[PDB]
């Protein structure tokens, strides 16, 4: 699924994820723009042999479980596959996990060289949210 800037917006506040962590909406519509350009389905293979999966393109060195990460962990207990999802749920569960670790929306490199710092709420203009 491919959402729109402000569905996505929506979606994301229900999930509780508006000032999680202290992270503004507009950060999270931002990192999600540039790490999947709202494309759930996205998928990204990584120089280390990870992938990244979905809206906020989580990686499977940590994170998610995709059967062929050497090593790694599946600390948000789910298949990789399930954060391509249509229902951005377990992409907000794992997330809120993720942006808990330590560095904040630091773990997001895109966010950290296009988001942060920026007029983050601009990604929310003109939204009914
Ligand atoms: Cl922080
Ligand atoms: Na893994």
């Not at 929506?10 to 507009?26: C, I, P, T, V």
């Not at 990204?44 to 979905?54: E, P």
């Amino acid at each position: 699924k491919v959402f729109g800037r402000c569905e996505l917006a929506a979606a994301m506040k229900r999930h509780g994820l508006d000032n999680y962590r202290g992270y503004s909406l507009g950060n999270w519509v931002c990192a999600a723009k540039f790490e999947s350009n709202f494309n759930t389905q996205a998928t990204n293979r990584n120089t280390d042999g990870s992938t990244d999966y979905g809206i906020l393109q989580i990686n499977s060195r940590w994170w998610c479980n995709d059967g062929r990460t050497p090593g790694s962990r599946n600390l948000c207990n789910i298949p990789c596959s399930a954060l391509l999802s249509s229902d951005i749920t377990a992409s907000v569960n794992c997330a809120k996990k993720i942006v808990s670790d330590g560095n904040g929306m630091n773990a997001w490199v895109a966010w950290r060289n296009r988001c942060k710092g920026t007029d983050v709420q601009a990604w929310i203009r003109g939204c009914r949210l």
